[PDB]
Amino acid sequence: KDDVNYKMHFRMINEQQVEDITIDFFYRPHTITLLSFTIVSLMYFAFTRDDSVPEDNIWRGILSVIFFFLIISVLAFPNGPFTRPHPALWRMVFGLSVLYFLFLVFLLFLNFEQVKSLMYWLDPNLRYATNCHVITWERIISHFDIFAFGHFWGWAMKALLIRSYGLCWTISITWELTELFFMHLLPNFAECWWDQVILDILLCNGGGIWLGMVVCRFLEMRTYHWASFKDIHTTTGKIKRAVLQFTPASWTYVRWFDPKSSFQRVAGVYLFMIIWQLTELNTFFLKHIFVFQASHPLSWGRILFIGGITAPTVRQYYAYLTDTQCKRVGTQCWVFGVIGFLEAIVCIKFGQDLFSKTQILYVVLWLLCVAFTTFLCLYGMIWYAEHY
Amino acid sequence: KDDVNYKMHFRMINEQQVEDITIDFFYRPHTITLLSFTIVSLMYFAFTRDDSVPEDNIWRGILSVIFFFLIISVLAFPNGPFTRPHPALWRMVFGLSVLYFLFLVFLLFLNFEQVKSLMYWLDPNLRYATNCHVITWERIISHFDIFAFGHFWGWAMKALLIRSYGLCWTISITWELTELFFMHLLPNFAECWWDQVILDILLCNGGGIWLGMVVCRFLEMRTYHWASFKDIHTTTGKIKRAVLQFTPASWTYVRWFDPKSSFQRVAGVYLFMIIWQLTELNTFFLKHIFVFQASHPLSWGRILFIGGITAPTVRQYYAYLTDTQCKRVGTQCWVFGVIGFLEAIVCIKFGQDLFSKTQILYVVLWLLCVAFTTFLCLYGMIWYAEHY
Ligand SMILES: CCCCCCCC/C=C/CCCCCCCC(=O)O[C@H](COC(=O)CCCCCCCCCCCCCCC)COP(=O)([O-])OCC[N+](C)(C)C
Ligand SMILES: CCCCCCCC/C=C/CCCCCCCC(=O)O[C@H](COC(=O)CCCCCCCCCCCCCCC)COP(=O)([O-])OCC[N+](C)(C)C
Ligand SMILES: CC(F)(F)CN1C(=O)c2[nH]nc(-c3cccc4[nH]c(=O)oc34)c2[C@@H]1c1ccc(Oc2cc(C(F)(F)F)cc(C(F)(F)F)c2)cc1
Ligand SMILES: CC(F)(F)CN1C(=O)c2[nH]nc(-c3cccc4[nH]c(=O)oc34)c2[C@@H]1c1ccc(Oc2cc(C(F)(F)F)cc(C(F)(F)F)c2)cc1
Ligand SMILES: [Ca+2]
Ligand SMILES: [Ca+2]
């Protein structure tokens, strides 16, 4: 009867079910109405759309395949550890992750010219894509952009889900140093290195981690009592509940290191940090292989999507690593890992024009040193946890 | 607490679980080994395959996307009412059905020249694709081919799953007459109409229905006691059990008509028969729009695949139609219906060159008459069931 408990502990981190349902309209399935909508909409598009332009036909077909795969996801895909604001949103996020996985699998079979032609079809303008000792006080605040906003809030979310100053500060410092080193390696016109080791570590990353940890401690201490949207008498309370419907209903108490932790625990945390830094390398290298612009919708959309699938992945990884009755890895964690490895394989396959013969050796030495430093600081964290 | 029973009755026709597991090796998940296999295999292909030929790159990429979507299906897709020979096979069948659904959704946005070019890319030889009163006794047996074998066994499987002489004989006669009429309409060199109303109704379809009904009655009467493969002492018993692992473990008692049946019951059975005849029309019309050859692997592979997804679809449709606690349509039935309607939309969109202005009116009149005859014989069946 331990197998029943095992399957329950997997079903609670893979497809979490909603508790205390009051407005039952949001949760009753209407799959036949969805089928009628699908058929009538595809009928309207087939019989009324003008399909004389073939490129537009291919683009609309791709968009519609994506839309209806998200519908299939809402129907049949797993939900994850999250049931807020609605499980269907997380099913659609899982479907997007599966689509991206299959996109990378396809990309691994084309050659460099075919992948470049694909990227040039998605963005026709991709073909033509390309003084620090006087750092004034105001050119410093000029550094803060919308992407600095993104860094801040991404680190806030990461520190919220990880619940550790040590892990977050380790990954922050190590990745900022790695990025500076690679920018020195590539030509990059890489002057002004005081905007990566100071403004990016101490203000964006540091403040983001601080905010994430404060909000995480708040969410841990608070007590969750959710009254129905119906029973609220006033209107301010009603809109307050409708807004809180987009917040966590309960919060997990995260502890990566036990008092006396096994070798499996340490190895799992080390693997976690290695895959974290690997997903950090994937973005840098994919943006440098093909000359991607940071303002294009796919560029920041892919980063937002990775940050979105990172939230269930961290919860499922923590559950599998620590919970003893969770005998299976969540499917979102599986897809996150396979994407994070396929992107590295893509970077290695199409990334032979980045460095010379000696610069690749420099990259390998730095990656070995980074892995060793990660292990050293993880061991230091475990020692401090055991003795203090 | 009726909602718990509702969700259980849906989970038992959507994801049936295996009972009495003895050899637990076949049923324990190894998702991390699957992830390692995926990554190592894609690494081997990325780093060793010669990708200088682009058409081969596109073909291999398509095949690999299909393979790894079947892997994702084995991971996360629903199983259906069946758990034999293994639920993973039916998960992969569901994944194939989803891929075909998305293929049709994509096809609905291209124009006729693009779809013809797609079919010519899949089969380069598609571009160049094209005396009864003396019917000897032996040219009759010459009619029996591998496709007659397929008709026989398809009707056997259908009569096994439907459990009705009336429904099966109705659909048989009506579809054979419709096919003869359409062959008379199209030029078709449609002589020798004694091979469709006699040899195809009375011998292939009739014998198939008889065999299916006999095997269905046998499977209903028998008692299922499954000893483990381990406990069998001899070797003949072991191989007998290993062969019976590819047979049903239990059989449902099918009854479409109650003594006094509601209007919803009659309407659901009528809709069942209409979608059956619609899926029969889809094959004929898709094979006549583009000049498809019956021997090409995709031609008969698509028919085998439809016959494969027909088995869970009929069980889930019967469950939803008759069981009062089954408040949701199975997902395989959903995808079967959406495919059967999307194929008809494809036939209507790309099928404007088949008939003239008057022949389309003839087709519409015959389809109305066929629907009316279907309803009449269904009402006759219900009357005979009520009074005899
Ligand atoms: C030139 C280049 C040089 C470079 C050199 C580099 C060299 C560096 C090489 C480092 C190699 C180190 C690997 C050590 C492996 C041992 C791990 C171990 O045993 O822990 C086990 C589990 O471990 C796991 O959970 C693994 C499964 C996860 C796989 C999915 C991927 C998703 C990741 C998403 C990450 C998200 C991050 C995103 C954050 C933003 C511990 O568990 P257990 O107790 O043993 O038993 C199982 C658990 N139960 C049963 C008890 C419940
Ligand atoms: C020119 C051309 C002219 C042409 C003219 C043609 C005109 C002809 C037009 C005919 C139109 C007739 C339609 C009548 C609709 C009423 C149906 C009804 O109420 O029954 C209801 C259900 O009914 C359903 O189950 C429907 C859901 C199925 C949808 C998925 C499709 C998959 C099909 C796969 C088929 C596989 C076949 C493959 C076989 C090889 C009855 O149920 P309920 O009791 O009311 O309540 C629900 C059940 N619970 C809750 C009790 C449990
Ligand atoms: C390994 C990699 F492919 F390189 C990942 N990529 C980056 O990391 C990155 N950053 N920017 C870009 C980028 C891409 C294109 C043009 C420009 N122009 C510019 O300036 O940047 C770009 C990219 C690419 C990237 C590709 C696809 C992608 O999402 C999808 C988009 C489509 C659809 F076809 F619809 F567009 C379909 C699918 C689905 F899988 F669902 F099929 C997914 C996101 C990022
Ligand atoms: C509405 C329709 F499209 F017409 C249905 N079709 C028929 O009914 C029919 N009959 N024959 C043919 C046929 C097709 C091609 C060449 C020749 N040459 C000849 O003689 O026949 C043919 C067809 C087509 C058909 C197309 C695809 C198909 O399966 C898939 C194949 C592929 C992959 F690209 F790999 F080939 C990918 C996918 C997936 F969806 F997974 F992406 C599905 C099965 C049938
Ligand atoms: Ca940085
Ligand atoms: Ca025929």
One DSSP character per residue, B268-330 reads HHHHHHHHHHHHHHHHHHHHHHTT--TTSHHHHHHHHHHHHHHHHHHHHHHHHHH-TT--S--
Question: Which residue owns the Cα nearest ligand 1 atom 17?
Answer: A268
Question: Which residue owns the Cα nearest ligand 1 atom 13?
Answer: A271
Residue A239 forms contact with B (CB below 8 Å): no
Residues 103-142 in B contacting A (C-alpha not used; CB under 8 Å): 105-111, 113-114
Residue B80: strand, helix, or coil:
strand
As a whole number of angstroms, the distance between CA B267 and CA B382 comes to 12
* Joined tokens for residue B203: 């011998």
* Helices assigned H by DSSP within B205-248: 206-221, 235-244
Q: Is B99 in the pocket of ligand 4 (CB under 6 A)?
A: yes
**Helix H or strand E segment including B46:** helix B31-48
Nearest CA-CA partner of B334 in A154, A381, A140, A72: A72
As a whole number of angstroms, the distance between CA A7 and CA A327 comes to 8
Out of A111, A331, A345, closest to residue B75 by CB: A331
Task: Count the alpha carbons within 13 Å of A353 in the hemisphere toward its beta carbon.
Answer: 8
* Owner of token pair 């009569």: B159
* Joined tokens for residue A341: 């490895």
Cα A335 to chain centroid distance, Å, stands at: 11
For residues B34, B35, B40 and B46, what is the CA-based torsion angle, rounded to 10 degrees? 120
* Owner of token pair 């695949």: B305
Cα A249 to chain centroid distance, Å, stands at: 21
Beta-ladder partners of A15: A80
Out of B98, B113, B328, closest to residue A72 by CB: B98
B277, B175 in Cβ contact below 8 A? yes
* Owner of token pair 């005998």: A327
The dihedral region occupied by A186, where left means phi > 0, alpha psi between -120 and 50, and beta the remainder, is: beta
User: φ and ψ at A15, to 5 degrees?
Assistant: -135, 85
Residues 309-348 in B contacting A (C-alpha not used; CB under 8 Å): 328-329, 331, 334-335, 337-338, 341-342, 345-346, 348
Task: Count the alpha carbons within 13 Å of B374 in the hemisphere toward its beta carbon.
Answer: 26
Nearest CA-CA partner of B71 in B44, B31, B16, B40: B31
Question: Which residue owns the Cα nearest ligand 1 atom 10?
Answer: A271
Out of B31, B68, B341, closest to residue A39 by CB: B341
Residue B154: strand, helix, or coil:
helix
Strands (E), chain B: none
User: How many Cβ pairs within 8 Å bridge chains A and B?
Assistant: 151
Q: Residue A9: which residues within 8 A CB-CB, separation 6 or more?
A: A323, A325, A326, A327
Q: Is B108 in the pocket of ligand 4 (CB under 6 A)?
A: no
Amino acid at B189: F
HEC-encoded secondary structure of chain A: CHHHHHHHHHHHHHECCCCCCCCHHHCCCCHHHHHHHHHHHHHHHHHHCCCCCHHHHHHHHHHHHHHHHHHHHHHHCCCECCCCCCHHHHHHHHHHHHHHHHHHHHHCCCCHHHHHHHHHHHCHHHCCCCCCCCCCHHHHHCCCCHHHHHHHHHHHHHHHHHCCHHHHHHHHHHHHHHHHHHHHHCCCCCCCCCCCCCCHHHHHHHHHHHHHHHHHHHHHHCCCCCCCCCCCCCHHHHHHHHHHCCCCCCCCCCCCCCCCCCHHHHHHHHHHHHHHHHHHHHHHHHHHHCCCCCCCHHHHHHHHHHHHHHHHHHHHHHHHHHCCCCCCCCHHHHHHHHHHHHHHHHHHHCCCCCCCHHHHHHHHHHHHHHHHHHHHHHHHHHHHHHHC
As a whole number of angstroms, the distance between CA B359 and CA A330 comes to 56
The dihedral region occupied by B222, where left means phi > 0, alpha psi between -120 and 50, and beta the remainder, is: beta
**Which chain B residue has the Cα nearest residue A62?**
B106
d(CA A279, ligand 6 centre) in Å: 57
Task: Count the alpha carbons within 13 Å of B321 in the hemisphere toward its beta carbon.
Answer: 24
Q: Is B292 in the pocket of ligand 4 (CB under 6 A)?
A: yes
Q: Residue A283: which residues within 8 A CB-CB, separation 6 or more?
A: A303, A306
Nearest CA-CA partner of B175 in B384, B378, B47, B367: B367
Cα A237 to chain centroid distance, Å, stands at: 33
d(CA B103, ligand 4 centre) in Å: 9
Would you call A57 and B98 a contact, using CB atoms and an 8 Å cutoff?
A: no
Chain A environment of B107 (Cβ under 8 Å): 61
* Joined tokens for residue A183: 């920018």
A37, B335 in Cβ contact below 8 A? no
Out of A31, A39, A338, closest to residue B38 by CB: A338
Cα B343 to chain centroid distance, Å, stands at: 13
Q: Is B310 in the pocket of ligand 2 (CB under 6 A)?
A: yes
Would you call A39 and B108 a contact, using CB atoms and an 8 Å cutoff?
A: no
B70, B96 in Cβ contact below 8 A? yes
| Ligand lying nearest the CA atom of residue B127 | 4
Distance from CA of B144 to the nearest CA of A (A): 38
Beta-ladder partners of A124: none
Distance from CA of A69 to the nearest CA of B (A): 7
Cα A62 to chain centroid distance, Å, stands at: 24
Nearest CA-CA partner of A386 in A254, A213, A262, A264: A262
Helix A2-14 crosses helix A297-322 at what angle (to 10 degrees)? 160
Would you call B62 and A337 a contact, using CB atoms and an 8 Å cutoff?
A: no
As a whole number of angstroms, the distance between CA A196 and CA A193 comes to 6
Residue B6 forms contact with A (CB below 8 Å): no
Report the b/e string of B268-283 with b at 16+ CB within 10 A: bbeebbebbbbbbbbb
The angstrom resolution of this structure is 2.9
Nearest CA-CA partner of A341 in B29, B45, B38: B38
Burial class (CB in 10 A: 0-12, 13-18, 19+), B378: buried
Nearest CA-CA partner of A140 in A129, A132, A130: A132
| Ligand lying nearest the CA atom of residue B98 | 4
Q: Is B381 in the pocket of ligand 4 (CB under 6 A)?
A: no
User: φ and ψ at A80, to 5 degrees?
Assistant: 105, -175
As a whole number of angstroms, the distance between CA B153 and CA B212 comes to 9
As a whole number of angstroms, the distance between CA A291 and CA A128 comes to 9
Q: Ligand 1 pocket: which residues have CB below 6 Å?
A: A 158, 264, 267-268, 270-272, 274-276, 279, 310, 313-314, 317, 320-321, 323-324, 326-327, 329, 333, 336-337, 364, 367-368, 371; B 32
Q: How was this structure determined?
A: cryo-EM
Helix B165-185 crosses helix B146-162 at what angle (to 10 degrees)? 140
Distance from CA of A1 to the nearest CA of B (A): 13
Chain B environment of A329 (Cβ under 8 Å): 31-32
As a whole number of angstroms, the distance between CA B98 and CA A75 comes to 11
Nearest CA-CA partner of A275 in A208, A338, A184, A201: A338
After which residues does chain B break, using C–N > 2.5 Å? Answer: 130
As a whole number of angstroms, the distance between CA A18 and CA A29 comes to 14
Cα B209 to chain centroid distance, Å, stands at: 16
Q: What angle do CA B270, B274, B162 make, to 5 degrees?
A: 70
Residues 22-81 in A contacting B (C-alpha not used; CB under 8 Å): 29, 31-32, 35, 38-39, 42-43, 45-47, 49, 51-52, 54, 57-58, 60-62, 64-65, 68-69, 72, 75-78
Cα A54 to chain centroid distance, Å, stands at: 35
**Helix H or strand E segment including B68:** helix B54-76
B309: number of Cβ within 10 Å: 21
Amino acid at A236: T
Q: What angle do CA A254, A258, A259 make, to 5 degrees?
A: 140
Beta-ladder partners of A80: A15
